Amino acid sequence: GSHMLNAEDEKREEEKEKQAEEMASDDLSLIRKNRMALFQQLTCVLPILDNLLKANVINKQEHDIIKQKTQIPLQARELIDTILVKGNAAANIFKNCLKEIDSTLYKNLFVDKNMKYIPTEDVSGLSLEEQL
């Protein structure tokens, strides 16, 4: 016997699975820091979703659910959540997707290490009944 079997379903299913902190490379820090930028500046949540859907924990169900009645902002939120679960393991897929989808973006993300910011949340245009 290579190893002895040990019960875990006794009391651990409810608890969240432990992530490999050791694996967590620096790239993870960059992704986490650029997390707001990605959510705040999204324009390719589809392309990346397609690439991730190729090989991930989500099947045709979870993928369809976020494609059933979910807008675009939420789609990005769920996609980000999938990265956290996978961890640095998905950093490669995430990075690979951006490189292919937007090679130029990579040259400004990891390379330049300087992400641009824009107040997209700030909007204006109130008019209950203009008649002037």
Short mmCIF file of C-alpha atoms in Angstrom, two decimals:
data_model
loop_
_atom_site.label_atom_id
_atom_site.label_comp_id
_atom_site.label_asym_id
_atom_site.label_seq_id
_atom_site.Cartn_x
_atom_site.Cartn_y
_atom_site.Cartn_z
CA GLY A 1 0.00 0.00 0.00
CA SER A 2 1.51 3.30 -1.13
CA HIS A 3 -0.37 5.14 1.62
CA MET A 4 -3.10 4.62 4.23
CA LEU A 5 -6.62 5.81 3.43
CA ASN A 6 -8.04 8.57 5.65
CA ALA A 7 -11.65 9.71 5.98
CA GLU A 8 -12.36 13.37 5.15
CA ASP A 9 -16.09 13.48 4.42
CA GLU A 10 -16.54 13.05 8.17
CA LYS A 11 -16.21 16.81 8.65
CA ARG A 12 -14.48 18.79 5.91
CA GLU A 13 -16.95 18.92 3.02
CA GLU A 14 -18.53 22.08 4.43
CA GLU A 15 -15.10 23.66 4.86
CA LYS A 16 -13.50 25.28 1.81
CA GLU A 17 -10.72 23.36 0.07
CA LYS A 18 -7.22 24.56 0.96
CA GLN A 19 -5.40 26.35 -1.88
CA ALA A 20 -1.73 25.90 -2.74
CA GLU A 21 -0.27 29.07 -1.23
CA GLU A 22 3.25 27.86 -2.02
CA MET A 23 2.45 27.70 -5.73
CA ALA A 24 0.97 31.21 -5.65
CA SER A 25 3.60 32.89 -7.82
CA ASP A 26 4.15 36.63 -8.19
CA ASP A 27 1.96 36.61 -11.30
CA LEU A 28 -0.95 35.96 -8.95
CA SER A 29 -0.21 39.22 -7.15
CA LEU A 30 -0.20 41.06 -10.48
CA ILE A 31 -3.54 39.50 -11.44
CA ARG A 32 -5.06 40.32 -8.05
CA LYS A 33 -3.82 43.90 -8.22
CA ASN A 34 -5.08 44.21 -11.79
CA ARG A 35 -8.32 42.61 -10.65
CA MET A 36 -10.07 45.98 -10.38
CA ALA A 37 -8.67 47.09 -13.72
CA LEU A 38 -10.01 43.96 -15.40
CA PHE A 39 -13.45 44.35 -13.83
CA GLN A 40 -13.46 48.12 -14.31
CA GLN A 41 -12.00 47.83 -17.83
CA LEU A 42 -13.68 44.84 -19.50
CA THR A 43 -14.23 44.44 -23.24
CA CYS A 44 -13.38 40.79 -23.97
CA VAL A 45 -15.14 38.72 -21.33
CA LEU A 46 -16.51 36.52 -24.11
CA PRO A 47 -13.18 35.54 -25.90
CA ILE A 48 -11.57 34.70 -22.55
CA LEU A 49 -14.64 32.79 -21.37
CA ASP A 50 -14.50 30.67 -24.51
CA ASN A 51 -10.83 29.85 -23.90
CA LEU A 52 -11.41 29.04 -20.23
CA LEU A 53 -14.46 26.94 -21.08
CA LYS A 54 -12.04 24.76 -23.05
CA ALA A 55 -10.60 23.29 -19.84
CA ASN A 56 -11.86 24.25 -16.39
CA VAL A 57 -13.92 23.15 -13.38
CA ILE A 58 -17.08 24.63 -14.90
CA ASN A 59 -19.04 22.44 -17.33
CA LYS A 60 -21.98 23.16 -19.62
CA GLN A 61 -24.08 23.92 -16.54
CA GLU A 62 -22.14 26.61 -14.68
CA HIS A 63 -21.15 28.06 -18.05
CA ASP A 64 -24.77 28.12 -19.27
CA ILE A 65 -26.00 29.59 -15.98
CA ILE A 66 -23.67 32.58 -16.34
CA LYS A 67 -24.83 32.75 -19.97
CA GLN A 68 -28.55 32.31 -19.29
CA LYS A 69 -29.64 35.62 -17.70
CA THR A 70 -26.35 37.26 -16.66
CA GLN A 71 -25.25 40.65 -17.97
CA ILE A 72 -21.60 41.42 -18.87
CA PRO A 73 -20.33 42.94 -15.54
CA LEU A 74 -21.41 39.85 -13.61
CA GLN A 75 -19.86 37.57 -16.22
CA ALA A 76 -16.51 39.17 -15.44
CA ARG A 77 -17.17 38.83 -11.71
CA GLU A 78 -17.82 35.10 -12.01
CA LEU A 79 -14.81 34.70 -14.29
CA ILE A 80 -12.60 36.39 -11.71
CA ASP A 81 -14.04 34.13 -9.03
CA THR A 82 -13.02 31.09 -11.12
CA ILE A 83 -9.43 32.38 -11.17
CA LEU A 84 -9.32 32.61 -7.38
CA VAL A 85 -10.46 29.00 -6.99
CA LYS A 86 -7.96 27.68 -9.54
CA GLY A 87 -5.21 30.03 -8.35
CA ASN A 88 -1.85 30.48 -10.05
CA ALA A 89 -2.84 27.34 -11.91
CA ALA A 90 -5.21 29.52 -13.94
CA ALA A 91 -2.76 32.41 -14.14
CA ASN A 92 -1.22 30.68 -17.14
CA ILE A 93 -4.59 30.26 -18.85
CA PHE A 94 -5.63 33.79 -17.94
CA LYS A 95 -2.34 35.18 -19.23
CA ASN A 96 -2.38 32.96 -22.32
CA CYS A 97 -5.89 34.12 -23.18
CA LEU A 98 -4.98 37.81 -22.91
CA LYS A 99 -1.80 37.26 -24.92
CA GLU A 100 -3.77 35.69 -27.76
CA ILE A 101 -6.91 37.83 -27.46
CA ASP A 102 -4.91 41.00 -26.83
CA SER A 103 -1.14 40.62 -27.20
CA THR A 104 -0.78 44.39 -27.00
CA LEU A 105 -2.51 44.44 -23.61
CA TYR A 106 0.08 42.03 -22.23
CA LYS A 107 2.87 44.36 -23.35
CA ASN A 108 1.18 46.96 -21.10
CA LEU A 109 0.17 44.68 -18.23
CA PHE A 110 3.10 42.51 -17.12
CA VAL A 111 5.70 44.33 -19.24
CA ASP A 112 4.90 48.00 -18.55
CA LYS A 113 3.60 47.01 -15.11
CA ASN A 114 1.62 50.27 -15.37
CA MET A 115 -2.14 49.83 -15.78
CA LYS A 116 -4.19 52.85 -16.85
CA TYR A 117 -7.31 53.93 -14.93
CA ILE A 118 -10.47 55.68 -16.14
CA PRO A 119 -13.62 56.78 -14.19
CA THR A 120 -16.18 54.74 -16.14
CA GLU A 121 -18.48 54.51 -13.12
CA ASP A 122 -18.86 58.30 -13.09
CA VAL A 123 -21.76 59.15 -15.43
CA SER A 124 -24.21 62.00 -15.95
CA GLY A 125 -27.36 62.75 -17.95
CA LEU A 126 -30.48 63.52 -15.88
CA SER A 127 -33.56 64.81 -17.70
CA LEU A 128 -37.00 64.21 -16.21
CA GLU A 129 -38.60 66.34 -18.92
CA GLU A 130 -36.41 68.83 -20.79
CA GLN A 131 -38.38 71.52 -22.62
CA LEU A 132 -36.02 74.50 -22.61
#
